[PDB]
Structures are given as structure tokens and as C-alpha cells.
């Protein structure tokens, strides 16, 4: 049974890796800041690959841990994960919970985004290294790839006479830079995509419609005054 | 082909919003305001109208997340005032058919913070009829009333041509919306709704911030019950082994 | 063997969807929608969509065109697949 | 779209696993050869004749033949299901051993087929990833991507079915299994079947209905049905939406000030914050002055920086108006 | 106070589901599993335990169990209708019929109605849904809806379970064999019916 | 294994009838001396025994025992219909203080019928019988038959004790307070019960 | 504060980060006497 | 715990006098013997003591 669990987990991981590397394709050269391209990276996490190997080929060799009446199955898994790969050693979050997490195959994969940042090539889109607008554009790119897949799949069932409505959101748009916001707008309109964007300061004055909201206290309750805005100053 | 377009969003009797209507742009609509301007409330009201599945809805904001944004009630009950309230969206179909989808929300009684939600849809409404006017009755000088579902049905039925429908299930709500080209995917299953909500809620937050990176796995990778059944088989074998040993 | 225009159309439609299908498996929940789309584009309503779709799927299965597999978890709790005969008919033209 | 296509067309009217093994061998050989040729990366015509024409049609045909073998296994498992059903109809009790043997051999066949599939899928997936890596050896290879794309899912799909069938079969088996201990062990001689049929044909002449303790399941107080918070709410309906040019209360003058400082930028003219603030604030009343000053500073400072800041000499608090307002500022010099 | 095995059964985690749903008129079979999978272990204990409430958990030669209240039953008695017995017998035939084994136990209300109308007489049957019916298709639709409602009530009483995602498709309990109580033996159906009413298992409506 | 005292309680010769009535939904007030005393003695175990059914054996502040079904009740629930709810409130309103001046604890179907007609709004009465009816004698007869049916339905639940004859005269048990509002010191029972009936 | 609070009272200093001759720098304009 | 320390530790010596654990661990084990419902953040009894 342990060997079977390991085998099914590995097959699922490989199938998902294939599917994600598959979905990666079909991306146009977005121009969010210096980010000139986006891609998805999927790989098996070594900490869990070692655990999978131990489960598949060395189950019996730690049966002592498993037959431990003191340990539940998730706790047994957590303790085994502590024994091998002891650099993850962690017990302040309860072993039950970490074992339960370990009962999710998806966690076993590292699933990250690479960005063609300038001419540096595909670099891991770490938030501490990318401009925040570039990261927001990357996330939007991922979301639009997903929704593109959704629409394409249902292309057969839907008649071409109808092109389904498209609408996503973006709070805290003040994070973005003018380059990222313009790239988002061009991508969305190219994809006939509608957007609802929010920021403290009006970072999109020259595009789309704009509203401003002000909250006032009034006789022990609250009201929101909405005022329109116009494209200049 | 002319993709359908969302036209406007009407928030009625919401927290801070009584009968507000925002006309959505064709491409980009922007909201501005300082601390606590309630923009997250507007986004939450829209998405609640889109996916009225109370379970999926859980609105920790993008920043200053959690209950302190008014979301210990899942950001629905307390983000509403007491009593009848509405969240409605007009859409111009690619067939060029106006359709106002909407949901009637009501705060549930007791110490609990549950919300009673009822989906509904309207077709044939004259393009001039603003939902704000449609959903409100002018009682008293310049301070209009909001009318419940039954009064709305009466008022709409009194209008020629307009057809008003209520969905006993969110599933048929989304089925009709899709049939009108409102949804890209046929959310036949609650799992489809779950992934849909995942995508919209991630977009709401935007970017690869901590929550988005954490839940990217869920967003991209479907759940597999095969792993779960295999793990449970291992568990049963281990239990029976322990029994035999003892 | 007997394939009316609507049935043969539904057959090509299922074949195309399968060629597009993620895992090649066809749940009855998708077969019903495909039948609805093909009848819609053919514009006939003798009875409910459900009854006509049921009769059609049963006809192709019995006509050795579809293979059915019960599965409670599947959408509509069943799955369907093309039989080799259906494959050889769909590909003859496609 | 294809609906009308068909409508106007008007058209109407080897399970041996060794075959799978030889097909897998052929696929591995051809796939390695095509991946090798793609890695060679010749010209566009070589790319085509090595990675579309041989690859596309060959891999398509052999994937379809492998799926044909899968469909033959599907028809055979169906056949054994109907054969078990029919045999139960003829032998009833005596069919138990035959049905169990048929289930066992079908399970073995499916297991061997799954093993034959998994025996090459992983390496074939690695080959496909190699082809994907090599595909970037030519910009026009987008179509190859679509094949490199498609062929993956097909392969996965095959493997998926390879497992899925067993997942179905093992389930179906258990149903059959339960059936033997839920149909025949209680109807060993089948007499119950014919007697039940006859009673159905003639029920009303034995009018009887079963007695249960179903008088009440659990009677209880009814809920406080649909009792909700409500107040017949009213509210001041929004008036005609006012408009302001992006906080024009500040942003008209933001445009004015950004222009009056963009001049300093354009001429790179030295900017003395004290003098400019003093000259400016006179245009506005004291209660607004602070609101003014910030707006000016947020503009003036962005234009260059003060060079004297690095001389180590602190600037002084130059007055800019009456009532005591002061500004510490070095003269902006370096734009 | 109690025998070891009876206290064991009453202590089983599944026991409350069993007891409660049997009191609620649900019956024991392959479906209704939580009330069957261990009651196979303590049939005699549960029967003697239930005798205290002047009720009997009855098993025919079939593997299904079901509750029957006495005349002096502590839990009050009630009965079902003719059409309920009808749908029940059809369901029992489906359960036994190996030909539909490929259905894997899943069956649709349309299949049920087709089989029912095939085996039974449409008009004489329909006499009971509405007394005045004379072959009107409105009464035929009424009968189909009544079949649906009886299937629902049988679901409430442990004969059938709707699939989690489908109320149109369902799986059948072995308690369906309760309906074959007049055919579980080769004796006359009427004398067996007399023995059921004697053992309070069935009564005419 | 099983708690020994729980085994003692369930083996008790009074356990069968008490358990059957509890499954029915019948409450056990102080008037049921043997059942009440047995419940008081063995509540500590019977609460667990019934909670195993996901049903709470609740002793009201009035002291009567009853089975509160949770949402997950393993005994599928039936409920008192709308007319049952309002007739139950009318029954409590027939058991509250003012009845002492009118019926001294022994009431008749006529008293309940008159109170229902005079106090309840005509709209809800029509909802009970039919919206289109209007005061007709036949509709009144149907309403009276439904009143008798719900009266017997309350009888099954030990909420009304019939005087032993076919005539529909009876007394009302304290458990009827499950229908009415909780009484507070200084509150007028008439006012609160009428506000709830209104 | 990040300038989203910057009231009239007190010595208000305007910190603005800039690179001056490759030196990381923060220019500081002072204001006071207001309120 | 303070009251027990004042007047009833002499019933708890068994915990105290055990070479298995140290004095602070003894205090932690006592305190968790008291208020048993109260779990801790799965930390060493050394730290708890």
C-alpha cells in the first residue's frame, strides 16, 4: 500500500508537470516594465521526493515509527519527515497539521513563475527582485492564461455568435508603475478583457471611467459619497 | 465578434451604500479614495452578485486583510446593512441583449452573521430604466425607500415585455448566465464554481503576493482523490497491523 | 446501423470534443450538452432535451457506437467512450 | 459552427498485449529519431520533413492505433460484462465460478495492459520534453509546438485511461462480487424471481401493504421560518453625480504648480524654495497656505536636488509668509 | 445488566445511525449501509433488544432486515400505499435481475417507470392514482409524478438513495426485498400475507 | 466497552416506553412521575445515549425532558405545521395566567376555537384553510377538522392531556411553554404572548 | 508617515530618496510655523 | 498551582522525585497536570518550567 501511494503520487505529479508545461505555451510578449515574457516552472520538491522514495522502497525500515500507538497516521508521516530531511525539522506547528499538509500531493511540487526580465533571460519572478507592478502583471498574465484556457475549452459548446463576457479585478493598483498599468490595459483590450482597478491615488486618470469614494459619519451611521472624475486637472 | 460587456453595478442598502450605481467602462473602470473608502466593499458586492454561493465567499482584503476589514462574518453580513439589499449587474450580450442579473441579500437574524441570498435575473428591461430607480421607490421627500423581492416582482410584472426569473439554485443561475455568454466555463459542478471563485479572488488581490503564491497550487492543480484513497488504504492497513500486533 | 443526420452530427461533435478532451473521457454531463447544441443548431424540439438525449445515447450505445461506464463520481455519474466502429465512421470523413 | 457544416452536408444512413508492446517499441524508436532530428535543427524545410511530416502523421497514426487497441480492450471488457450477465441468466448459481474466473482474467489483462503502457510512457514523456526543448531551435516551429503540445496530452490521456479503466473495472467487479452474495445466495434456485414476477403481474389480488413504526419520525417545534433582519429601509437617493478633475480642489493647482515648476526644469533654472514659496503663497489665504506648501514641495523637490546639501552646511529657516511660517531649504541646483 | 455482545453492539459507532433510522422507518440493505454492515454482526442481539419496545427486526431468507411494530408497539405504527409496494417490487426485480448488472446498481426514474408499465397494466394500475381515470394522458403524467413521489418516500424509508449530484439517478437497498415478502416462499401469497399481518409485517390499505 | 450505569439505565424496565415516546417527540414533564424520576436519576448517561443519535436530551427550566433534534439528527425529523405552531401558541396562551379566570385548567375545543378565531388574523386563518375562502361555513368546518387533527398531534407529543372521552376537552401541560416566550419577572404573560402571536 | 498623514502642526520634514552622483541620498525640505 | 504548591505538592512528589525529568520540567508537568484542558504550543517542558 505504501508503494502504491508513492507510485500514484508520482504519477499524479508527472501528469500535472506535463499539463503545466503544456499550458505554459501560447503567451505573447507582455511588456510589463522590464518583464518581456512570462513562463511557469513546475518541479518536484526534493524534501518530499526523498520522503516519497523512503515510502516506496523503505516503508518497512521505519515501521517502528508507524506502529507507534502514540503516533497517528499524519503524526507518523510528520515524524518520518522529521527523521529524514531533518533540515525541515519543525514541531511548533503541530505534527498532525504538517502531516496533513503532507497528505496533499500538490504541495510536493514547487510551482513558480519565470519572467524574461529585460535581456537577463528567464529569472524566477521573486517579489523581492521584481518591481511590484511587474509582479502584478505576472499574476494577471497567469490569470488570463487560465481564463483563456477556460474559454477555449468551452469554445465548442458555445456558439461563435456569443463571445463570453470578460471581467477581472485588481486592488491596490498604486503598486503598479505606468508601464505596468499601460501593459495591463493593452493586454486586456487586446483580449477584449474588462478590468476593475482600485488605488488610493488615481493611477489611471487618462484611461477608462473613474469614481472617487469618501466615507462620512452621520448621526451614528456611515454614508459613502461617490463623485465622478474627469481626465485632466 | 462583439464581446458582451458589463455596463453598471448597483449596490443597494450596502454598508455605506444605499442606492449607489457605478457605470462600468467598456475596458477600464477605476475607483479611488483614501483609507477605508470602501472600494473592497464594492468589489466584494460585485463578486457576490457574480457567485452568490455563500460558502465560497470569504473576503479577506488584499491588504489589511482579515476580520478588522469587517469580515469576521465572511465580509458579507456586516458589509451589508440590516434588511433588504441588492447587488445587480447589467450586461449587454454579444447578441446585443440587455440582461440584468442580480441577487437580493438580507442579514440573517440572531447573533449569527449569516446572509440569506436569492439570485434573480431580468430580461427585456428598457435600456433607459436604471436599476437604481427600478430597485427603489420614492417614499418621503428626496429619501427613497428600497422595496423587497415581492414588490420588485409586482413592479416588473406590471411592465410590459420584461421577464423576471428567480433561480431556485445557483447552478441554474450560472447555467443561464453562461447560455447568455456571461461565463466562459459551464460551472456545472460546485468544483467548477470553486476554481472560478479562486481565479476571481486571486485577481482581486492581484499579483504574486503571499496569498496568491500560496494558493497558486490550488489555482492551477486540480485536487485528486486518488492520492486520498491511497493514503486512506495505507491508514487502514496500518491500523489493522497495529491490531494484529497487540 | 442507422445514423440520422442529427445522430451522425452528434457523433462528429463527440469525436471532435474527444480530440479536444483533456483525458479523452466523456462524461454524460458533456454528452447531454453536445446533444443540446446539435439539436439547437438543427432546431428540432419533439420533447424535452433530456428524453431525446437519453434516447439518442441509448441508440448509439446499442448500435455499437458508444461504450458506457458507470461511475458515481463522474458528472452525471457516468462516462462514455467511442467504440472502434464509431471511430472508423468519424475518421472516414474527418 | 460545425453544426451547420454537418447540417448542410446532409450525410446520414487483437487484444494480445504483444501488439501493444511492438507498437510501444515502434513509438519509442520513431519518437527518439524525430527528437534527434529536431535537435539537429536543420533549415525550415529540414525542420518540416523531420518534425512535422514524419512526426505528425506517424505519431498520430500510432497514437490512434494504440487508442484502437485501448478501444478493443474496451469492447472486450464490455463483452465479458454482457457474457457474465448472460451466463448468470442461463446457469444462475452454476455461473458463480465462471464469472469469478472471468473477472480474475479480465483483471489480469487490464493489469498487464496498464503495465505495458506505463513501461514506456515516462521515457516517452522525457522524449517529448526533449522535443519541446529542441523546438526553440527555429522561430517558425510554432506548429511543431502544437504537435509537441498535443502529443503530450494524448500520451497522458492514454495513460489516464490505462489507469481509469482499472479504476472502473475494480469497482464494477465489486458490484458483481456483491451481486453474488446479494442476489443468488438468497435465490439459489431462482424461484423467487419467477414468483416475484407473477406476484407483480397479479398484485392487487393479494392486497397488502407493509407495516412500520413510521407514525412519526421525530415531531418537533417548527423553525422560526424566514424571520430576518429588516427595517423597511430608506435613504437619501444619490443626486446627479458631480464631477471633479481628479481632486481638482487640489489638482487644478497641482497642474498650475507642476507647470510653474516644469518651467524651472525646462530652463534648469535654480529654484529657491524660500523665494518661490513666498512669492506664491500670497495668491492664497492663510488657512489654505499649508495645503499649498505641501503641494508645491511635492513638486519642487522632484526637480533635481540641492548641491549645497552635500557641503555640510545646514540651510536656514527662511520665512515665506506672515504668521511665522518657515521653510528650511537649500537652493535646488542639480537637475 | 446486559450481555457482552449486546452492549458491544450498542457501543458501536454505527449503532446510533442504525437505531435512529430504523425508528424513522428506514430499512436494512446493501444501501442503507451504516445500518447493515454491523447489524449483520449482532442480528440476534438487536432483535432481542428491539423486542423490549414491542417491535421486531425481521429478516426473511433474504439478507435484508426491516422493522415491524407490534399491535402493542411502543413506537407507534403506520403503513405504506399500494403504489409504494408496486415501485418496491419493480425495484426488487431490478435488484435481482442480473441483466442490468452493468448498471452497477444505478438506475433512473425513467427506467423504473418503463419497467413498471411494461410488467404491470397501465389502466388498472392508474385506477388507484385517481379513481376516475380512463386513459387520459394527464392521469398518466399524474401517475409518473406519483411514482417520483413514492420513490422519494421510499428514499425516506430506506429503499433507495439519490446520488449526491443526481436526484434522477439512484441506488437501491436490499431492503427492497421486503417488497418480496409475499414471494420469499413458495406458499400461497394470500396465506403468507395472513402470516405477515399475524406478524404485523403487512396489512391491506 | 460501555459505561456500566448506561447499561443499567438502558436495561431498566422503564427504558423501552420512555425511549419510544422520546423517539416520537413526546416531552416528559414532572407529571410523568416514574419517567421524570428515572430521567432525573439517569440523565448523565441518557444525554450521551441520545447525543449518539445527535439528539440532545434537554431538561427545560420548567423541568420537562424533551429530545431536541440537531440539524444532523440521526432520527429524521418531522415538524409541527404552521397551524400546529399557531395552535400551540394559542394552547400556551390557554395555559397562561388568564385561563385561571375562565377555564381553571380544563378547556374545550370551543375555547381554543373561539380564541383562535378572535385573536388570529383572518389572513393566516385563510392561509390555514385556503386564500380564496371567505368566512364560509364549510371552510370553518375544514378549519375545525384541522384544529382537531393538530390537537391530537399535540396529544401524541404529550403536550395536551385529553380527558378520557370522545368529547374534545383536555388539560395543557407545562411543556407547552416551548411554544411561548420565556417568562421574565415583571413581564405580563398576556402582553408577551400576544406580541408573539401577533 | 508616508505622506498620507502630514498635518499642519509641527516641524514637517519632506524626505525624498534620490541618487545624487551615484550616492544614495534623501533630500529633506523643512517646514514649520504652520497652524 | 500556587495553592497546591502551598499545601498539596506533597501528593505530587511522585512527579517531583522522578529522575526522568528536571525541576523546571517537574513544574511544567505539574501545571499541565493542573488545568489539564489547557494545552501549550507543543514546546519543551523545559521552557514551560
Numbering used by the authors:
A (entry chain B): 1236 to 1468
B (entry chain B): 2 to 247
C (entry chain D): 22 to 115
D (entry chain C): 10 to 22, 119 to 440
E (entry chain E): 9 to 213
F (entry chain F): 9 to 206
G (entry chain A): 1434 to 1468
H (entry chain A): 1286 to 1334
Pull verbatim passages from the article behind this deposition.
The ring-like structural maintenance of chromosomes (SMC) complex MukBEF folds the genome of Escherichia coli and related bacteria into large loops, presumably by active DNA loop extrusion. MukBEF activity within the replication terminus macrodomain is suppressed by the sequence-specific unloader MatP. MukBEF is the SMC complex of E. coli and other enterobacteria. Its SMC subunit is MukB, which associates with the kleisin MukF (Woo et al., 2009; Zawadzka et al., 2018).
In the same sample that produced reconstructions of MukBEF bound to MatP-matS, we also observed particles with disengaged heads and that were neither DNA nor MatP bound. Although the map was resolved to only 6.8 Å, which prevented determination of the nucleotide state, it was very similar to exploratory reconstructions of nucleotide-free MukBEF. Hence, we refer to it as the “apo state. The apo complex is comparable in size and shape to apo yeast condensin, with arms fully juxtaposed. The apo clamp is more flexible because it is not held in place by ATP and DNA, but clear density was observed at lower contour levels that allowed unambiguous positioning of MukEF. The apo form, however, lacks both MatP and DNA and therefore represents the result of a completed unloading reaction. In the apo state, the heads disengage and tilt, and the joints and larynx become closely juxtaposed. The hinge follows the tilting κ-MukB neck during DNA unloading, and the hinge-proximal arm changes from a straightened conformation to a strongly curved one. Intriguingly, the neck gate is open by a narrow cleft along the interface in the MatP/DNA-bound structure but is closed in the apo structure. The minimum backbone Van-der-Waals (VDW) distance is 2.8 Å across the interface in the MatP/DNA-bound state, which is reduced to 0.1-Å minimum backbone VDW distance in the apo structure.
